[PDB]
Design a protein that fits this description.
transport protein; monomer; 4 helices; Calcium; Polycystin-2; mainly alpha; Protein X
Length: about 80
């Protein structure tokens, strides 16, 4: 719960997806309001329509790649 398995948000993308489909699911995962807001907000620019494949897959790859690089520091030093 504390670690917040974001992998759940990334898994979603079954063509038809909107702030409700993901948020309602994430709520059960014990996710935080700030995280939930940020996650949908980033993948959903105007959160008014359904998220297609290209938009959803593009960000997903970009976010996954950033999550690793962000964690995996360049070196032990600051």
């Amino acid at each position: 719960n504390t670690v917040d398995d974001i992998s759940e948000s990334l898994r979603q993308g079954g063509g038809k997806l909107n702030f409700d489909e993901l948020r309602q699911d994430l709520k059960g995962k014990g996710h935080t309001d700030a995280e939930i807001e940020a996650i949908f907000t980033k993948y959903d620019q105007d959160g008014d329509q359904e998220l297609t494949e290209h938009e959803h897959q593009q960000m997903r790859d970009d976010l996954e790649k950033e999550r690793e690089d962000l964690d995996l520091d360049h070196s032990s030093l600051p």
